[PDB]
Ligand SMILES: CN(c1ccccc1C(=O)Nc1ccc(S(=O)(=O)N2CCCCC2)cc1)S(C)(=O)=O
Ligand SMILES: CN(c1ccccc1C(=O)Nc1ccc(S(=O)(=O)N2CCCCC2)cc1)S(C)(=O)=O
Ligand SMILES: [Mn+2]
Ligand SMILES: [Mn+2]
């Protein structure tokens with residue numbers, strides 16, 4: 001099976017979610033063919049030089065999975081778009097583009113975080129266009145750590161636009177889309193490419209985790225409580 | 229694994245949902261230890277003497293499962309409370325009470341349809357108390373079929389009360405509850421019996437089916453599209 005997760009929003013203040021993630025990594029993930037993390041792995045990210053110990057605990061847990069023969073992949077979310085090549089290296093994770101078209105046992109599937117589908121929030125889209133500008137990023141990342149922390153400190157979810165969904169599945173000519181961002185776990189049926197299509201939406205990790213499990217014959221969205 | 233499903237609302241007008249159910253019965257269900265159907269298997273029921281061919285197609289598909297060594301069980305919903313011992317016999321299904329406390333590989337779990345938890349709808353609860361009165365049922369069931377059909381024809385969802393949930397899990401001293409009715413698939417965490425508790429809610433069958441799969445170590449809520 002190939003596994004997809006998203007919207008863990010991992011942080012120092014929620015160790016319970018972190019332990020549920022580490023349980024997942026040490027059991028479920030080890031049996032998989034591949035693990036894809038579709039963004040918002042972290043609640044925030046101000047650069048790979050942050051010495052936050054949570055960041056290394058996570059990179060090490062993912063790296064163990066990678067080193068067991070299970071490739072892990074990462075698509076950025078809106079929370080963690082600054083995750084960079086040094087984190088990739090520490091984690092063993094391969095950074096992917098904002099949209100990837102995969103081939104899972106013969107089935108073609110589009111993966112993305114899902115924030116780009118939220119076209120009714122121009123407030124957000126304006127923000128995203130800015131923070132995706134490389135010179136703006138590199139500016140931020142050139143600041144001393146202590147100034148970046150204070151900038152984030154200061155800065156303290158629209159559903160998808162149905163048409164944006166259809167447009168994305170039609171650009172890639174796919175009948176399957178997996179995404180997160182919206183925190184509304186569900187399987188949807190629509191039409192794309194003159195045919196039945198499915199959009200599978202992952203949940204955020206709070207009381208429960210969620211994953212999409214793709215096998216040769218089946219696609220399942222699975223929720224699991226943190227009970228052990 | 230032990231499987232739980234609910235809220236299929238099967239009917240003549242939705243053959244697609246019926247085929248998705250029959251797929252499920254012929255694959256997934258055959259590998260299970262037991263299958264529990266927690267109510268609203270049918271969109272309506274006016275008695276086991278209804279000759280609706282859908283009713284026999286379903287009973288035969290369930291009976292095949294039962295005859296393969298997989299016991300099936302049924303708790304009534306609000307839609308199909310008149311399902312009776314003749315349908316049980318045709319289907320091989322065992323009729324259970326409105327609340328059952330099960331033992332699944334050592335774990336104690338409460339199952340119910342879930343309409344009884346909806347105590348903020350007195351409109352419904354009044355209705356339910358009436359249609360659960362045996363003399364009222366037997367009256368209805370004594371009518372000629374054609375009159376019952378016309379009575380149903382004339383008759384053309386509140387979420388749970390959180391306290392009613394806690395009260396139910398505390399009456400049975402359980403940390404696990406599985407139910408349907410509300411059509412809001414989710415895993416919830418609460419407190420019961422001074423401890424962590426989980427309520428797992430099944431979805432209705434529309435574009436997707438849903439099931440709770442209980443194994444010795446895990447409880448998962450699974451959604452699956454009808455894609456094959
Ligand atoms: C949907 N999100 C937004 C909606 C409208 C506008 C902005 C956002 C948004 O993602 N904001 C946001 C705020 C802070 C972060 S951060 O990781 O702390 N960091 C990014 C690098 C610059 C400093 C801030 C990352 C993202 S939300 C509600 O989750 O924050
Ligand atoms: C939650 N349900 C109710 C809410 C308020 C009041 C009543 C109901 C309700 O379940 N009504 C209802 C109506 C008809 C049926 S029936 O199967 O067709 N049949 C039952 C036997 C008597 C004749 C009608 C079964 C149930 S709902 C909205 O699903 O119908
Ligand atoms: Mn998120
Ligand atoms: Mn997001």
Ligand SMILES: [Mn+2]
Nearest residue numbers: 235268409432
């Ligand atoms: Mn129902």
Ligand SMILES: [Mn+2]
Nearest residue numbers: 268305306409
């Ligand atoms: Mn119901």
